[PDB]
Ligand binder design. Structure first.
Ligand SMILES: Nc1ncnc2c1ncn2[C@@H]1O[C@H](COP(=O)(O)O)[C@@H](O)[C@H]1O
Ligand SMILES: [Zn+2]
Length: 176
DNA sequence: GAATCATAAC
């Protein structure tokens, strides 16, 4: 019932399921940080990245392939670039893969923490995580994630530094 | 005046 269990409730709601198969389910991010923003969750929950082991390798690969399928099935006309990844220190329970388009045009993207959670090392690429599991049997999340969320705003396309969220949103129009 | 930061949510 906690706010932090929200993903489990949503993924069980038939009207919220964008796609589902034997292993995973896709829901829209309720507070999307870009035009296209999905979350991929396994039916068998993973508590956290620390609990990930070599036994999850195939599932993590399946979550990745399902994310890419959803892009094709639902975002083909946009021509947007996408990234797939995990937040190093999530707030919502149940490990979930972010699948998010790189326009970052959304009213829900409101503050520096939002921006840096998709545009610093706090965002762990899905491919990088799969390789970590495939090679070490575990996901290593490096120390100091909270500080990355406070970094000054930097455009992800041209690396220009911006002083505020409104000016960043205005700057992003140059990359239409 | 606008935007951000720090803190709480019973
Ligand atoms: N009930 C919900 N259904 C879908 N997405 C949600 C829900 N509650 C929160 N979210 C999103 O889930 C993500 C949780 O962030 P994080 O824990 O950092 O991976 C955020 O991007 C939220 O916008
Ligand atoms: Zn730029």
């Amino acid at each position: 019932g906690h706010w932090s269990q929200g993903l489990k409730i949503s993924m069980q709601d038939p009207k919220m399921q964008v796609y589902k198969d034997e292993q995973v389910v896709v829901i829209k991010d309720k507070y999307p940080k870009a035009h296209y923003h999905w979350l991929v969750l396994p039916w068998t929950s993973i508590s956290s990245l620390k609990a990930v082991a070599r036994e999850h390798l195939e599932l993590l690969k399946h979550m990745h392939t399902v994310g890419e399928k959803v892009i094709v099935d639902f975002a083909g006309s946009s021509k947007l670039r996408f990234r797939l990844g995990y937040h190093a220190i999530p707030s919502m329970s149940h490990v979930h893969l972010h699948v998010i388009s790189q326009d970052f045009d959304s009213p829900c993207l409101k503050n520096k923490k939002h921006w840096n959670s998709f545009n610093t090392e706090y965002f762990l690429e899905s491919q990088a995580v799969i390789e970590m599991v495939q090679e070490a049997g575990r996901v290593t999340v490096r120390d100091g994630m909270p500080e990355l969320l406070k970094l000054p705003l930097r455009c992800h396309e041209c690396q220009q530094l911006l002083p505020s969220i409104p000016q960043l949103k205005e700057h992003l129009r140059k990359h239409w």
